[PDB]
RNA sequence: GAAGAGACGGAGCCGCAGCGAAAGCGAGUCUGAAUAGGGCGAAUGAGUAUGUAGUCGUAGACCCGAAACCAUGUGAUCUA
RNA sequence: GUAUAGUUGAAGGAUUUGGAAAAUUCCGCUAAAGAGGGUGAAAGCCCCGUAGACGAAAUGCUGACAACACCUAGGAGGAUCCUGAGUACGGCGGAACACGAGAAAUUCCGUCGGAAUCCGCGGGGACCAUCCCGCAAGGCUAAAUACUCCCUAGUGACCGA
């Protein structure tokens, strides 16, 4: 855990050291797998329904007799073999969500962040400041650090002049220091983060 | 016999068990009597329970 | 909803600690002048589970 | 490991769908065979039914009663005490307070299994007639308060 | 907190000790006059939370099919 | 302050295949706006929009704080007085309490009997005594809770005749 520091373009001050409790812990792979599936499977609305025989706006009398006609025997017009009848075993509203224990969640977070440390994809910036929300200048900031792919920016607090300049190309998605989830991180290739965001991560993640 | 004029007694309903507990439905009715009383001085005739004649 | 356990077996069977069940014997609450004296001694004491009847009953006594 | 994923080995089975053609093994009556009331819709008798033979619970007699005032304790034996080295006032507080006795039931009783070599002191609500001798052999002090 | 991951929240529940209907006793206890014998225990003897799959229970529960039953209403332009 | 009309709102050209380009190939520009829809095919830069910013004559709604209505006193004494009546409770016959008369407390209903007044009265699952906790037979009362005929604005590992 030694990551260099960049200014806006000035290069390589003292390398920040990071907690080996977090950023060095040899990631488990099945935990991250089930964390991703539990997260992405928790985003469903369940709103979908299908009428059945007691709900189809129909009638409730034998149209025929049981004998005499010589045709097969029927009970009601609306029943699953007819056209316009009800449906047997349709999809009903459910909720699809479930919560893991409170050790594997932090194990997943530590494992993901140690994974991105070990392949040198945290680029720590000493601090981001704009006098005005100019999205061209933030593009020039990413051009100075020479990052091109899908990237993250982790911000501190109300940097309202640095968060209002990320409605960019889909290289960039932006999360504050509180809402850092798993799918926001594993999907990306590199992460930009300030110095103080790393500290507020190391308070919650101990 | 429909109501009382002073109390709130009216006819009602309940079961009827008999020696092996078979249930039917009764008509439990209050005792009522047509009594000439003095409503605001002018006499009427009205149904009054015997309970309020004590 | 939850299952409902049987209230005929809770008043007749108590569960041991090894896994089985204790059972109280029958032919004890009637005429005795027919029976001998070895029988009425040997029908005071509790017996255990036969593994035939542990199959179909297991799910009823799910917690007691 | 990124979005484009591997489960653990043996971590997730598939299903078995029933009534879909005569070469999966479960087409034409679905693993139910020929006729009879185990093979109708929603059939099968209730649990513990054995025909009209009088079943096992109506064959053996009712027995016992339950006290209303049964007062049973929250037993710790003796080895659990053997990590509090010397002088603590073992108690229905700080004894618990590390994951030892959650949910005391009617006060704590102490038993005598199996070796204590310390000089502790105990405050419980009952004691066995060998735990006192085991504690006072090691030189501690006990009080039923 | 974005119908979200995402932390607080330790009331509670399960295992760590059993035997007896019970008062109670405790690695032991019950019956018994018995320190005898016997039942059931202990002598390294691992559970718990979530996912997934097989089976069962409560719900119409693999779908289609009666003769009949009960409660409101509609009819004497046909016919008596 | 808000609800019912709204205003304004950045940045692109040429070539190739074409019936027609948003498609392709070169070189640019914008972004607090790269959500969506439309245009002779698939558009950040054509149109309607979106981010931002601004706006109400008339009527309704919600805060606020003024006015006006209301309402609310202490300490000690204890001779005498008051504190909810055909009520409480009992017998008989039914119901409600998880409780099917059961050893059956507590709550009502029909009928017939029917108390005491603070040295009092009720209750603590028949009943008695001791202790403990409470004053019935007069009224009012916001919020946390359940539903959606309809209105506005949205979403879906929901359908596509």
XYZ file of C-alpha atoms in Angstrom, chain C:
64
model
C -47.820 -19.783 8.372
C -46.159 -21.884 11.055
C -46.753 -25.561 11.551
C -48.889 -26.660 14.474
C -47.535 -29.488 16.580
C -49.765 -32.317 17.669
C -51.444 -31.929 21.048
C -51.953 -35.618 21.546
C -48.290 -36.474 21.433
C -47.188 -33.620 23.657
C -49.236 -35.146 26.483
C -47.791 -38.634 25.989
C -44.129 -38.463 24.857
C -41.111 -36.574 26.202
C -37.879 -36.192 24.259
C -34.598 -37.493 25.647
C -31.148 -36.007 25.137
C -29.650 -38.663 22.920
C -32.243 -38.130 20.217
C -34.932 -40.738 20.845
C -38.173 -40.480 22.795
C -39.500 -41.961 26.036
C -42.829 -43.772 25.829
C -45.233 -44.949 28.523
C -46.563 -48.470 28.150
C -50.182 -49.520 27.693
C -52.487 -52.133 29.294
C -52.074 -50.372 32.636
C -55.413 -48.708 33.389
C -58.061 -51.422 33.341
C -58.856 -54.846 34.687
C -55.857 -56.524 36.303
C -57.350 -59.818 37.510
C -56.867 -61.260 34.047
C -53.196 -60.384 33.906
C -50.428 -62.201 35.754
C -47.911 -60.712 38.158
C -44.870 -60.749 35.889
C -46.869 -58.712 33.389
C -48.023 -56.050 35.821
C -44.460 -55.636 37.093
C -42.959 -55.450 33.621
C -45.572 -52.916 32.470
C -44.526 -50.157 34.860
C -41.381 -49.178 33.044
C -40.931 -46.997 30.006
C -39.786 -48.178 26.592
C -38.041 -46.461 23.720
C -38.674 -45.713 20.050
C -39.165 -48.334 17.389
C -37.577 -46.918 14.232
C -40.626 -47.741 12.135
C -42.811 -45.201 13.895
C -40.112 -42.577 14.161
C -40.465 -41.917 10.425
C -44.094 -40.876 10.108
C -44.229 -39.020 13.430
C -40.965 -36.930 13.296
C -42.477 -33.984 11.454
C -45.451 -33.609 13.815
C -43.284 -33.245 16.933
C -41.096 -30.726 15.184
C -40.075 -28.793 18.301
C -41.565 -30.517 21.356
